[PDB]
């Protein structure tokens, strides 16, 4: 995963042509925006809610993003009962 | 035991080229991994070796393929493999002698006429 | 801390392996290990490796000059001999 | 001890080295002694100074 560091630079990524996926992580502080691209998951690390939102807003419709999320249930099963 | 401690490759031995080094895991366990090959390489030149380079990089044989030239680039001729002083020397030595050689010819050149 | 009355290194063999030998040996221990002059760099630091294999610490020069001590009289003499003779040979 | 002293000036170099060797042929026989020693010697230099 390669980490991305300035907002603009990131925007270019989000439109990388490939840049499959992004994803939003929230933790205390912060929220990581993780982009799924080739060779890596290029990732820009967003603390700030204010800016965060706006940049989050900026998401071109086309944006694939999930936010980091909780117990999905892994979904294995054993095939009796 | 109390650890352990298992083997992550089949050849179990210690071996020269072989090393492993220990880690605490995310599963929080102690664990071997292999710890690669030594700094054998980028010595000086000179006389059974035996010193090392400057700037340009010191590693070992599998690494170099990788190793970048621009990290492998501080330089003067014959001494991309060298750091100053030996090179200074070898310059110097030619230069002068080759003056005296010329001088020698020149000495003899007057004696003839 | 104690350094024996008369045998140096020989302390290793204790009593084993007899006095006359101890004599014979003692002699060479002194010659071979000693630090001995450098030629050009002129200090004594020419140390044996292997079997009389002598590099100068500190001018990093290696001189082949054999056995237990480097350059025999004979050799030297010879060295003169040649000095002379060759010299004469030119002279 | 020596070194720090040296940088402190507490030791002068000649003396520093001397103790170094002296240390090396130890006659300092405990720390306590040595440090003491050093004050005293410094007295001799001061005496020397006063004298001078």
């Amino acid at each position: 995963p390669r980490e991305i560091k300035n907002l603009k630079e990131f925007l270019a990524i989000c439109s990388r042509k490939d840049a499959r996926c992004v994803k939003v992580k929230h933790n205390p502080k912060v929220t990581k925006f993780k982009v799924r691209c080739s060779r890596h998951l290029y990732t820009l690390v967003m603390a700030d809610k204010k800016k965060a939102d706006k940049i989050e807003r900026s998401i071109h419709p086309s944006v694939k993003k999930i936010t980091v999320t909780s117990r999905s249930h892994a979904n294995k099963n054993t095939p009796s009962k | 035991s109390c650890p352990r401690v298992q083997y992550r490759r089949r050849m179990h031995y210690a071996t020269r080229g072989n090393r492993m080094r220990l880690v605490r895991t995310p599963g929080n366990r102690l664990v071997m991994q292999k710890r690669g090959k030594r700094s054998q390489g980028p010595h000086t030149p000179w006389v059974l070796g035996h010193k090392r380079l400057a700037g340009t990089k010191a590693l070992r044989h599998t690494k170099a393929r990788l190793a970048p030239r621009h990290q492998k680039t501080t330089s003067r001729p014959y001494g991309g493999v060298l750091s100053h002083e030996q090179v200074r020397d070898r310059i110097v030595r030619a230069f002068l002698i080759e003056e005296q050689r010329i001088v020698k010819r020149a000495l003899k050149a007057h004696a003839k006429v | 801390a104690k350094r024996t009355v008369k045998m140096g290194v020989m302390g290793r063999y204790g009593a084993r392996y007899g006095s006359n030998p101890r004599k014979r040996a003692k002699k060479l221990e002194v010659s071979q290990h000693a630090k001995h002059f450098c030629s050009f760099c002129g200090k004594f630091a020419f140390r044996r490796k292997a079997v009389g294999i002598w590099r100068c610490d500190g001018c990093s020069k290696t001189v082949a000059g054999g056995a237990y001590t480097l350059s025999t009289p004979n050799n030297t003499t010879v060295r003169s001999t040649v000095r002379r003779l060759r010299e004469l040979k030119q002279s | 001890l020596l070194r720090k002293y040296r940088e402190e000036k507490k030791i002068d170099r000649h003396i520093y080295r001397e103790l170094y060797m002296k240390a090396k042929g130890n006659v300092f026989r405990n720390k306590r002694n040595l440090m003491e020693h050093i004050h005293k010697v410094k007295n001799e230099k001061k005496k020397a100074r006063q004298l001078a």
Partner: protein, 62 residues
């Protein structure tokens, strides 16, 4: 660069690889290689041949 090598059989202590220029058009440094005949009697040579084209059979010991 580009030369001709200069190390083989060991006689006394020059330090290695040295530019000895040889045959009778050798000068006569120690180790230098001159024909024995054209080396002067009483001189002390080492490794003389015998076969000639053997580079020192005789005295090939230490």
């Amino acid at each position: 660069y580009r030369r001709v090598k200069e190390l083989m059989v060991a006689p006394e202590g020059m330090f290695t690889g040295q530019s000895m220029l040889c045959g009778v058009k050798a000068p006569l440094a120690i180790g230098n290689v001159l024909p024995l005949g054209q080396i002067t009697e009483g001189c002390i040579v080492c490794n003389v041949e015998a076969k000639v084209g053997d580079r020192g059979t005789l005295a090939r010991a230490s």
